[PDB]
Design a protein around this ligand. Structure first.
Ligand SMILES: CN1c2c(O)nc(N)nc2NC[C@@H]1CNc1ccc(C(=O)N[C@@H](CCC(=O)O)C(=O)O)cc1
Ligand SMILES: CN1c2c(O)nc(N)nc2NC[C@@H]1CNc1ccc(C(=O)N[C@@H](CCC(=O)O)C(=O)O)cc1
Lengths: 371, 371
């Protein structure tokens, strides 16, 4: 029933406690508690198996045009092997999914989107490719079979450096390159992550997947990490979790992701939902995504947020205890008046009202490697 | 939100009455009644848009091995450019989806699956490719962007001959070829269908899709046909509608599809679900799919089937009036001792029993073009 990734056995052999996630079998954690796995990631580096995520290639001389007809970013402006976080929007301005798209030098776009949205996402693009060809233009879509690994943390680069002949110091955040990793040729190394720390993601061919993970794991700096730690790290980093912090009813502006909207796109008005989105850039927003902090009982998704008079003003979309801060962190939507960092709010926790404070994101300073 | 084929506007412009079908927006019928469209199809020919079905390619030298591990047919025995209907079965012998597999001379298997199952099937094959690649085998999957048109009827061949250089008399039932149809190159023409009549199916590159459709439609012999007509045409031909007549709870034996089991594989008991299927082939089976005919109001899906003793013995999976026979036809499951043609049964229709007779399928003799 549950789909397996090329590292299935690998997890079972390393104390991986499998669970159902987006129809896949993945380790929620391993031998060490997730809080320890978390802290370990922010001090050394951990290995994440994110092979369940959809990896696609947009081929054709008109690839950029196809992608920009679906996303909000300035894709054309992207330099070779340069990538960015972006969003798929609908005519209403909502978000269909968040993704990372890279303008590779192999004449193709390297797109990576959420595993829980692959059916939605693949149909969306497949349909656009057609619609585009129906208008006489060169474009193609192709799904990758490659496995996907994520090495994240301060010592992550050093570790991978041992198995690559390239100067990782020349691979800045959000750029990638095809290189042979630990013997496995044809790998895609992208300086990106979902942890807030420095790190990379290796798109490796299935045949070499286990070899790569084993090689990487041979280093004493590396420790495997499961879903649980993946989620607590990304929240501290203030990264969105599609389906929770954002969805088809939250616009890029309401979701505090305005920076993803390209400058030219803003001026062109050529992206789905632009009629709605652009006007909001002018403060015309009824709500906004913010970070919350509190003590004691942890704030959970779906919990109401009230002002200090106890009037409901919003809802929590994600929350869990922060290992790096020894407090509870969360994301939610509140009116603009209450989005200023330091704002005092109340959150219904475990049925009771709990005092919380709006925190600037990321809750923990990021360590992205930049030149 | 419904997905649209490359022929969406073409349908609207020709009077298509759009409806929701398997998540797509397709015409249920056009200007002419589904009844007249039906008959027109059996006397001349009709054009159907089936671009919503999943068209995939299995690449690699291990394609036959990958496929055989997923389907029941003898794939290795297929001569070049020869195709066959086949089934996807789980270890329990359940049918996951039915499809048509062609062993093209271009080094790849050409597969076509139901639109309503593209998520399931694609995942199924993708996962197998992954598993096989991790075993050093050379194999790959690829989804086609092509649209898919079906011209069915006694005059379809003639109508199409005017747009191709090749003698279609050389393209027997269940065989295909890559040829230039009405100016569009790269089209794969296949002598197959879902109507019981002679016919072809064209896999045409989207850019020429609308051109090919109008090109064909220009002939006075041709007339567009919608969903209702497609349903009544296949039912008369005794063909299964996955989801209705067969599903994951029906084996190829219970489904009266024993013939789809490859000749060699059947005798060797070497195919998915064999441990459940073989005993059934031998006789240890509880229910069989059959055809039923009656007068008055048409028998519909989910309607109870009973013997003359007021004992419920089965259910109707599909059903509708037959334009060609001016009677009501349907498919349903009944215990084996009640499956002999000529057997009288009672079927609940509009909250009232009606006398019905078990009929051998197809209800209307087919006219495939074979040598
Ligand atoms: C989870 N996720 C994800 C992931 O982890 N990795 C890849 N390669 N692709 C994807 N694709 C889909 C999805 C989108 N998730 C993400 C992924 C990355 C970020 C992120 O690093 N954002 C940065 C901005 C980076 C930038 O400048 O583009 C930030 O600190 O705000 C924010 C959200
Ligand atoms: C609906 N459907 C379909 C379709 O119409 N066309 C294609 N190309 N591919 C597919 N793939 C999935 C699905 C399966 N539907 C079908 C399609 C065709 C048949 C059919 O003509 N069967 C013949 C046997 C043909 C054979 O010998 O292989 C018969 O008379 O029973 C029976 C069922």
């Amino acid at each position: 029933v549950l789909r397996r990734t090329p590292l299935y056995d690998f997890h079972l052999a390393h104390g991986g406690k499998m669970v159902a996630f987006a129809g896949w079998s993945l380790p929620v954690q391993y031998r060490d508690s997730h809080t320890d796995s978390h802290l370990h990631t922010r001090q050394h580096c951990s290995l994440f198996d994110v092979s369940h995520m959809l990896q696609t290639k947009i081929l054709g001389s008109d690839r950029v045009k196809l992608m920009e007809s679906l996303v909000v970013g300035d894709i054309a402006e992207l330099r070779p092997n340069q990538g960015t976080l972006s969003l798929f929007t609908n005519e209403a301005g909502g978000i269909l999914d968040d993704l990372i798209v890279t303008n590779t030098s192999e004449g193709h776009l390297y797109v990576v989107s959420n595993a829980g949205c692959w059916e939605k996402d693949l149909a969306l693009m497949q349909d656009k490719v057609r619609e585009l060809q129906n208008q006489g233009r060169d474009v193609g879509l192709e799904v990758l079979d490659n496995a996907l690994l994520a090495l994240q943390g301060p010592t992550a680069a050093q570790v991978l450096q041992a198995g690559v002949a390239d100067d990782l110091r020349k691979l800045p955040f959000m750029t990638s390159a095809v290189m042979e990793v630990f013997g496995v040729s044809g790998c895609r190394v992208t300086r990106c992550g979902y942890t807030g720390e420095d790190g990379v993601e290796i798109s490796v061919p299935v045949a070499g997947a286990v070899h790569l993970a084993t090689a990487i794991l041979k280093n004493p700096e590396v420790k495997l990490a499961g879903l649980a730690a993946r989620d607590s790290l990304r929240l501290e980093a203030g990264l969105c979790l599609y389906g929770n912090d954002i969805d088809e009813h939250t616009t890029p502006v309401e979701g505090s992701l305005s920076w993803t909207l390209g400058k030219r796109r803003r001026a062109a008005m050529d992206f789905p939902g632009a009629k709605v989105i652009v006007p909001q850039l002018k403060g015309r927003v009824q709500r906004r995504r913010v970070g919350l902090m509190c003590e004691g009982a942890p704030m959970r998704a779906h919990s109401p947020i009230l002002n200090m008079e106890g009037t409901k003003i919003g809802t929590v979309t994600s929350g869990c205890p922060s290992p790096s801060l020894k407090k509870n962190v969360a994301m939610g939507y509140v009116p603009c008046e209450y989005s200023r960092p330091g704002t005092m709010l109340l959150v219904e926790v475990r049925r009771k009202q709990q005092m919380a404070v709006v925190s600037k994101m990321p809750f923990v300073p990021t360590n992205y490697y930049t030149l």
